[PDB]
Each structure stands twice: as C-alpha cells, then as structure tokens.
Amino acid sequence: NILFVDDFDAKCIVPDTAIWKLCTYANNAWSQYFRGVDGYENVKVEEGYLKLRACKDNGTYKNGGVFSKIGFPCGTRLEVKARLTKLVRGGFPAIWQMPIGAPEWPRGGEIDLMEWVQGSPKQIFQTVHTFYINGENGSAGVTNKEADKNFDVTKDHVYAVQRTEKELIFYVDGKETWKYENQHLDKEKLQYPFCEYPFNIILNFSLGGELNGMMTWPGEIHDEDLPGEMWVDWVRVVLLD
Ligand SMILES: [Ca+2]
C-alpha cells in the first residue's frame, strides 16, 4: 500500500516543483553552503536519479539539496534508495525528516535515516533528536552506536524508518538496525513528538569544514575530493496495514 512514490523518472530535468523545494541558507553545518546556490545548479533529475551535487565553484562551497513540501502521517514507512558517487572528506550527505508545523527545533523532533562523515567512513549514522534528548542547546541526539562498521555508502542501499505511535524502527537494506521507543511520559516532556506532526523528506549532499571557526562533525573539506554527488533512485512512503 503506497501512499507516495517519486522514482525521479518524470520528463523533467528538475524534481517535481509541487513536491520538492530547493534547500536555503542557514548558519548551521548542513545549511551554510546553500548560500549563493543559483536555483537548480546543484540539483537535477537525470537517468531516473535525483542527483544532488557538492562542489566548489570559484572558491564558493555549494550544497545540493531539496525538501518535500508534503509530510506524512504515523502508521507509515519511508524508504529511500541512494548511493554516493564518491567518498568526499568534509562531505555531509543526509536522508532525513523534519516535522511540518512543529514548534522550534528540536521540540517537534527530527529523524535521520542516513548521515555520513569522514570521521567513520565505513559507517552511516541513524539518529533521533527531541527536546527530551537535546534540551535547548544539545545537537548529538540518540544515534545507533551498534551501526554497521563495514558499510560502503558508494553502493545503492535502501535507508528506511517505520514511524508508529509506539516506536521508530530503522532499517538498512530491509534489515532492522534499531528502534527508538515511545516512553509514554507526560506529553509535557516532549520525549516522543513523532506522531503529532506530519514529517517531510529531506535529501541533501552538504559540505562541512568550520562553522563560525568551530569544526563541524563532518570535519575538514578536502577540495581535491570534489565534486561529489548523491544519486537517489527513489523515495516511497508505505501505509502499514
Ligand atoms: Ca529512479
């Protein structure tokens, strides 16, 4: 039972303009290099892929990224098939979900299906953020510490999360990796916001380096590794029985 699918196979050179919006600048690790990105110069649909490019164009770092204007209810599973063309040191690709119409981050939560950093290059990270975990200042969230440490992100993999009232279940390649569970605390504690808001889909290949002279988690950008691309074959949202 398919609620939403984009196979990026439309007769169009950009992703569906009603569904997908270009990521915009903000002063954070994932967003800083959307600044001065001219329209779709780092985003295209080609040969059945959404291709998100990270590059340096005349000394300016530029990220490739879109987010969905639509969001999805609980009782659903998101599956995203993607690969990186190349390992890029300082590269910071991600597949993730934000609440639509939540209060300020992280009070509505955040679900990361995939993040990659050079600091652990044979891994991907799957992570959850809430106000209960992060409070006002925290950014680490709760990550799968037992994540696969012999993993090649440059091959096609299906990254997935199943979201119910009870829990988030993470998968890689159809194999359960971990669960983040509803603790059923007073809603006041903001421990499990994941079913109060529709959640969207965010697909990006960002660049790290320093943010206001502090080294970001993805670490030092090696310009010799650029350009790089994340190729998304498809995204789908399945409605559970
Ligand atoms: Ca496709």
Numbering used by the authors: 34 to 274
Give sentences copied directly from the paper behind this entry:
Here we describe the discovery and characterisation of endo-acting glycoside hydrolases expressed by mucin-degrading members of the HGM that are able to cleave the O-glycan chains of a range of different animal and human mucins. These O-glycanases display endo-β1,4-galactosidase activity and specifically target the polyLacNAc structures that comprise the main backbone of many mucin glycan chains. All of the GH16 enzymes comprise a β-jellyroll fold, characteristic of the family, consisting of two β-sheets composed of β-strands that form the core fold, which were superimposable with other GH16 structures previously published. Overall these data reveal that the nine GH16 enzymes analysed are endo acting β1,4-galactosidases that display a preference for polyLacNAc structures found in mucins and other similar glycans such as KS.
The apo structures of BACCAC_02680, BACCAC_02680E143Q, BACCAC_03717 and Amuc_0724 were obtained to 2.0, 2.1, 2.1 and 2.7 Å, respectively. BF4060 and BACCAC_02680 display 79% identity and unsurprisingly the structures of these two enzymes are almost identical in the cleft region. Firstly, in the −1 subsites of the structures from Bacteroides spp., the closed space around the O4 hydroxyl explains why only Gal configured sugars can be recognised as the equatorial O4 of glucose would not be accommodated. For example, BACCAC_02680 residues W131 and W138 are platforms for the −1 and −2 sugars, respectively. BF4060 (and also its close homologue BACCAC_02680) has a significant preference for TriLacNAc over milk oligosaccharides and analysis of the +1 subsite shows a narrow slot where a GlcNAc would insert with the N-acetyl pointing away from the cleft and S174 from Finger 5 would pincer the N-acetyl against finger 6, thus generating specificity for GlcNAc over glucose. BF4060, BACCAC_02680 and BACCAC_03717 also displayed some very weak activity against laminarin.
